[PDB]
Structure 1
């Protein structure tokens, strides 16, 4: 949460001169926050998962490529 909340705060601070004053600051910050949350969701959808399968439960498993090596004496 605080990375995307502070990134929304940076993008609100760096674009405050375009505020035409037709509304209040709260709806502007609301739309900026939801747009940054959806942009972070899109960027997370492009990224691989962070905590999908544990690595200790990966060597003793079928089709392990780099966890186990075919190297015998």
Structure 2
């Protein structure tokens, strides 16, 4: 849903390449759920955090080599996919007795043998969006779902770019109030 967003990534990536770890943190926060979503298509849920972690570390280490030949997100996703797939290969080379163990370790033995559902969050977000005034709904919709820049949104809603900026902000603030608890 963007390209101008790529602009921010490039600026952040340039700083990380110079040694700025704070800038990397911003990128990780930006890409953490997207990367998890991608990784979760390939590995078992129990392994998703470890694979996501390894993907980000691999990306950080290889960042000297990102020349901006392609968009940073694409470069990062390829790394995450490869990281995930390698995990699947390792798992698919399990011995005979690894499945037998899983089977015998599965059932609880007498005696003794951070999380949220994304659909839950999505319901909250969309319910809030549906309750916003038309002006805010359209603004954040055009920006986040269609990927349109403020200039494009301005022409579409026939309003100043300053007004687009403010409308998107207020939509976000409204949603955050119901989400960020």
Shorter chain as normaliser: what TM range? Answer: 0.5 to 0.7
1:16 equivalenced with 2:121 (yes/no): no
TM superposition score normalised by structure 2: 0.28
Deviates more, 1:58-67 or 1:25-34: 58-67
* CA deviations over 1:22-65 (Å, ceiling 9, x no partner): 11110011101110111000111123479744799799999999
Where relative contact order (Cα < 8 A, 6+ residues apart) is larger, the structure is: 1
Deviates more, 1:32-41 or 1:61-70: 61-70
CA distance in structure 1 between the aligned counterparts of 2:67 and 2:54, rounded to whole angstroms: 22
What's the CA shift for 1:21? 1.0
TM superposition score normalised by structure 1: 0.63
Structure 1 segments of 4+ aligned residues over 6 angstroms from their partners: 54-73
Greater helix fraction, Structure 1 or Structure 2: 2
Number of corresponding residues? 73
